[PDB]
Symmetry: D3
Subunit: 198 residues, 6 copies
């Protein structure tokens, strides 16, 4: 759906700048507090495939299954798992089907299962840890697959851009995208000048 | 909607029993971890009017406004506020319109504003604290008004019964209600026997 | 340097739940001391800050220095970091504080000798209570009339404190009147809005 | 299998607060003497007596709690190590009746409690970290062994030593140092009770 | 009392992410030690527990007693409560542990002398690292071959530990074989399910 | 406005770990000597030097951070008290360039950091609690005063005293006790380096 010529231009921006400019627009809550980079040296931007977990009513995972077959290639996955230290949102298998489907990145307010195998895969993912547990093993089990999400302290709606970095993830809404792509270029260059004068 | 002859009979049950029996049915997650009683000595059961807060995207409260005018008298309000220590979900005003509308109780995974005035009102409410802040003042602002809710570690769907007590709140789903009303009577009496033999 | 005594008598007629909304109106966004909870309900305090600050220990007293300088109407804004191993005040110091007529105490910490300092009819605001005393486990006392980061807010010595069951709020002497002339506006159109919902 | 202490030292100790006792123990080379966590269930009390210690431990799905109450002699205090779990209400209404019929002095729980509305109307004083509808083995803990060295709070508590507990908190005073407090605190009371006037 | 050496050589071929699912299958629900994180990546450990337990201090050594009883293949399941003020092991004890051939260490606590105990090619699992040493701030050592509540799980002396980057899992000698005869079932129909998704 | 110390004591101290220094300070009557919180940004380092201390404080919406870097002499270490805030990235890419051009030895932050991908490729070693896209005054903190007594970690740090910092953590060694470590640790090294063989 989004303009592919913007996912490119937004990628030239760092989260630390895209967040600092989202501020002056009048939006302080754009940094996902929780998700950290599994491995160093990555940057990712793209539309946000939202995933929402909910607390498990034991017998009251084709909730999150129906997401992976809905990845228009180049998407970023944003998962709401409440920072649970006992649910693995994605395992070694479901990450394969992500990069094979054209996945750009993964951001989780939770943890991720099978760390040794999933590190040696070509997808950068942001999580709060690593568990042996799977999704529907503990107090949580998946729910929806394209709805508003409270990962971090941020409102991540389906479609918005996620400028992932080593500083963390920053949600840029599809409305204020170009407003920043142009506002950050005139910033990181002004900054780039002062870098060479020293 | 629910059978009024069950809200009565469920009220004869304590949360500590209704939760312990919800367990053996095959449901461990029924106790809302967080909400505590504002004042001692209360018990409440009724259908759950669900309220869901979401993180505030500053300029992107008629979300929670549309709940209070939807209280078929006798309801219980269950609020998802993520235990925020900087959002007052309900103030001295909106609690009046609750008991005036026929509100049975309030359960909040957050805090409540204007504690001195709201204590001298005839409604029992469960919260995690008291704030001077209002709802849309901090990182949160309301969202939906009759949807699934993750207050506590529990899945609270619209309609289910909330057997509030001093032990805390326990969500009894409309399916397993009668299964427990009859299972707890044969328990707390068996227990009541052993109370008199000592 | 206590200010207009009519500010207290007028601001004490403002809830803290309103003082935030009318300080948030003024742009002052963080004014609620996240931590201090009322020891017993029904209290209400308004007055200037006599900020007490603690800092971690090292073994290389300043706690009395505040009390010998307490003035009637003062509020004791203590920055104890929430240490559940340091009793900031006890049976003695609470007396010395009320022997002078201290209007109230707001602590980001705990209390020594809870069973006694409750019958002493002085309103307190702390994070708990401990059988420890200050400078026992992890932090000495320190400066006694300086800026203080009490909950997540800057308490500058002189500011006004509004402490009701919601918690305490810091009202600076600079922007103090703009709230009383906006709480009156609020209360009027709350009172009238309260009359109508009844009938 | 310890043995009860000099009963006239317990009565001589209940004149002492937990602050002073914790302060003297600090001066004797024992800074770990305040059980951080347990708060009073109701406002006015004082309890002194030895510690019949109960230790919970994590429940691996492969009745030693009832045996604890069988060994509760009069005048003694119960100490529980429940790791502060908000999903294991240790002692319910019934197991506290047994504690009072045996003449128990008080209860200190590094964990929540079961059947709050009832146990608040019993005469026993309890210090704990909350209240739950869960029971003692429902979730992630279960009773393990009794009368072993217990680490409740942050304090090393071995079965036998005395537990002064006012509204400040609980303090484990060992028997070998129990007299050294009564000598120091007795005259220290004449110190403090004097200067209260000038 | 180390068991069937073929259990190690067969269980070490099972990930911890699978051992949970096949212990959760057996009803054993809490088997993941919530806390211990790998010091450096790429490690893998399987062996019996030599459970070390700490308890809070009082000032009234048992830490070496474990090491003088460490046996080749042992895993050191330490219960340090996550104390960021107690260095459980240092440059010395890590050697003594590997001088005996200790297969790995799983700590619910921290580490003393991180810059050195990383070049020592022994896989560790802790909650952090501290310039403190054990029995300095808040807890003594204690029993050295008893049951241990390491993360939120009961480590009984004898059980098997599977520690890969996900964290450690406690496999009891009782129900150890039922997993290897179910991980083989899993891996086969994961491998075949992995072949197909490619093409 | 302190003054630099005996530079040949700093070089004599960089031979000492932070464990031993913290251990000696413990033996000298100073148990508060490890800044709990700050972790290394990258794995292999050691930094010793005095503390140019910066103190953040809560931001009340009514540039003393740039003035801190102006006073940074060579060989010294920077200490920041940011209360561990995950919404105030204190020093960015630029303000670390200034720190290295001035010849700063190292940075220790009781808080997160700004512009992670860049500052990891600079030669400076930093100890902090995370990484953020937020900047130094965006959210709830803002720079207050510099070169005042700083409480970063759990330690009393007054401007001037030395900060040994390996991969274990940071340790504030006061100047008056700085020599007492080098004497004790020097021979203690001959103690430990000996028994490493038997």
């Amino acid at each position: 759906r989004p303009d592919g010529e913007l996912v490119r231009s937004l990628n030239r921006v760092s989260s630390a700048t895209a967040c600092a400019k989202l501020h002056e627009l009048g939006i302080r809550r754009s940094y996902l507090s929780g998700p950290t980079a599994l491995d160093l040296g990555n940057k990712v931007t793209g539309p946000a495939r939202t995933l929402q977990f909910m607390p498990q009513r034991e017998d009251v995972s084709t909730a999150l299954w129906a997401v992976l077959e809905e990845v228009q290639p180049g998407d970023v996955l944003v998962v709401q798992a409440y920072g649970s230290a006992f649910t693995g949102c994605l395992g070694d298998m479901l990450v394969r089907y992500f990069k094979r489907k054209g996945g750009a990145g993964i951001v989780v307010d939770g943890r991720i299962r099978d760390a040794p195998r999933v590190r040696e895969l070509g997808v950068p993912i942001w999580c709060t840890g690593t568990t042996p547990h799977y999704a529907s093993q503990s107090e949580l089990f998946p729910w929806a697959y394209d709805v508003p999400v409270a990962a971090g302290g941020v409102l991540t709606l389906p479609g918005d851009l996620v400028v992932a970095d080593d500083d963390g993830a920053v949600v840029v809404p599809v409305s204020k995208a170009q407003e920043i792509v142009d506002s950050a270029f005139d910033h990181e260059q002004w900054e780039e000048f002062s870098r060479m004068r020293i």
